[PDB]
Amino acid sequence: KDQANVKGCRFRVSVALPVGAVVNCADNTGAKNLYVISVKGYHGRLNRLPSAALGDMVMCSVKKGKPELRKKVLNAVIIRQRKSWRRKDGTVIYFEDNAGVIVNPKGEMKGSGIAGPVAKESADLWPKISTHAPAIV
RNA sequence: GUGGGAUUGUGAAGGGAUCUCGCAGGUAUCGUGAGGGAAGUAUGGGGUAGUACGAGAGGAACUCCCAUGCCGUGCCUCUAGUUUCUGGGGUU
Ligand SMILES: [Mg+2]
Ligand SMILES: [Mg+2]
Ligand SMILES: [Mg+2]
Ligand SMILES: [Mg+2]
Ligand SMILES: [Mg+2]
Ligand SMILES: [Mg+2]
């Protein structure tokens, strides 16, 4: 689909990363980590922090990395999370780290390589990431 | 009428009068429903369709399917949390 609207095409996934979380960057663009600012498609509720999960597009900024990428607001897609989630076939699964990839507002991926596995929930929603994924788990 | 009690404060025994109360319900189920409360609410995707309209740039919507947010009422098969079963083990 390659669109920021994912709730209507993705099953429920337990939320993992509230605002202020720092995750690894799995691309080869020179960024080393990403800081979560907000989540696309979040409707508000008093006192509740926005929280992201697999396959979500977030607004972020680079804290450690090449100076040409820092002090700006960018778009990223979450591909790995440590919070365990349950699939409809009854399997509970989780990763070892939290990782995302910097992309375009239209979902086009900046960079040309991905390190580590990529979740199927993200691969199905974003095809270019699925193209560059070394392994889809 | 019947059965119980009791009369005003100064000793005991008998009678009389008067007054008050009781004289039919108890126990156990299944239901009715006047009146009162009152709740569900939003977004996206597929398809319609690169269609209608428009010189062109551009660019919709309903029946019908599939998901999600908030709210509400429960539940403990799975996953996670909690241990004064101090359960089993280890260690100063
Ligand atoms: Mg507050
Ligand atoms: Mg009524
Ligand atoms: Mg609903
Ligand atoms: Mg347990
Ligand atoms: Mg338990
Ligand atoms: Mg001991």
Provide DSSP, A3-56. Answer: SS--TTTS------EETT-EEEE-SSSSB-EEEEEEETTPPP-TTPPPEE-TT-
Place of tokens 């193209």: A131
The DSSP H or E segment spanning A90 is: none
A104 Cβ partners below 8 Å, 6+ apart? A75, A110
Chain B bases closer than 7 angstroms to a protein Cβ: 43-46, 66-71, 78-80
Q: Provide the annotated binding site of A for Mg(2+).
A: 47
**Which residues surround the ion ligand 1 when the cut-off is CB under 5 Å?**
A 47
Amino acid found at A38: S
Residue A14 to residue A75: CA distance in whole angstroms: 21
Resolution (A): 2.4
Greatest extent of chain A over all pairs of C-alpha atoms, in Å: 45
A33 Cβ partners below 8 Å, 6+ apart? A22, A23, A24, A25, A62, A63, A64, A65
Nucleic strand B interface residues, CB < 7 Å: A 1, 3, 5, 7-12, 43, 45, 48, 84, 86, 90, 92
| Length of chain A as a residue count | 137
CB count, 10 Å around CB of A26?
27
